[PDB]
Design the sequence.
């Protein structure tokens, strides 16, 4: 049993995944992801489904130092789901620098159609970052990290991790 | 995390 209240107060990145891949019983699969700067229309990252045996649950981002000065990014995700209905699909995503919380984002997906491709846009409003923090984040790649916790009907069914470089 | 893919 892991519910939203169990992650909404976390003050550091988790030392392990909080669920196994097998707990994804709704067979949710991200097949496209794109991030864009809402103030320029620049595409900052895009991946599309066409070893790395944990590719499914860890992603590493290479951004530029300008990324940290953005106001707002729009993320578009496409995902398939299996044949079971999915109700109240929700992601809580928490970003830390050296286990100082930067921001937590709480996104509710729209209605998910079973056995189909689905699409959702997430808008990220950046927190205020001090000059000192920005300088540190640039100088220390991959010490910025995030946990993405996915819930269906208030139960954790996926957990993905990421880290970030701003070293350009 | 939505940028993950097998
Ligand atoms: C999963 O792959 C995470 C997707 C990351 C999208 C970019 C979100 C940027 C939000 C800024 C966090 C606050 C510190 C810059």
Sequence:
């Amino acid at each position: 049993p892991i519910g939203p209240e169990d992650v909404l107060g976390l003050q550091r990145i988790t030392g392990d995944y909080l669920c196994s891949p097998e707990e994804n019983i709704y067979k949710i699969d991200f097949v496209r992801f794109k991030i864009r700067d809402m103030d320029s229309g620049t595409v900052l990252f895009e991946i599309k489904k066409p070893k790395d045996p944990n590719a499914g649950r860890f992603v590493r981002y290479q951004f530029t130092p300008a990324f940290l000065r953005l106001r707002q990014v729009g993320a578009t995700v496409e995902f398939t789901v299996g044949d079971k209905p999915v109700n109240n699909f929700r992601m809580i995503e928490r970003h830390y620098f050296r286990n100082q919380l930067l921001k937590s984002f709480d996104f509710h997906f729209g209605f998910c159609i079973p056995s189909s491709k689905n699409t959702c846009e997430h808008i990220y409003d950046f927190p205020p970052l001090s000059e000192e923090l920005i300088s540190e984040m640039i100088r220390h790649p991959y010490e910025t990290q995030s946990d993405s916790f996915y819930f269906v009907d208030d139960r954790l069914v996926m957990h993905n991790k990421a880290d970030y470089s701003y070293s350009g | 995390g939505c940028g993950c893919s097998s």
About this structure: The pocket of myristic acid is lined by residues A 35, 59, 68, 73, 75, 95, 102-103, 124, 126-127, 146, 148, 162; B 1-3 (CB under 6 Å). The interface with chain A takes residues 1-6 of chain B (CB under 8 Å).
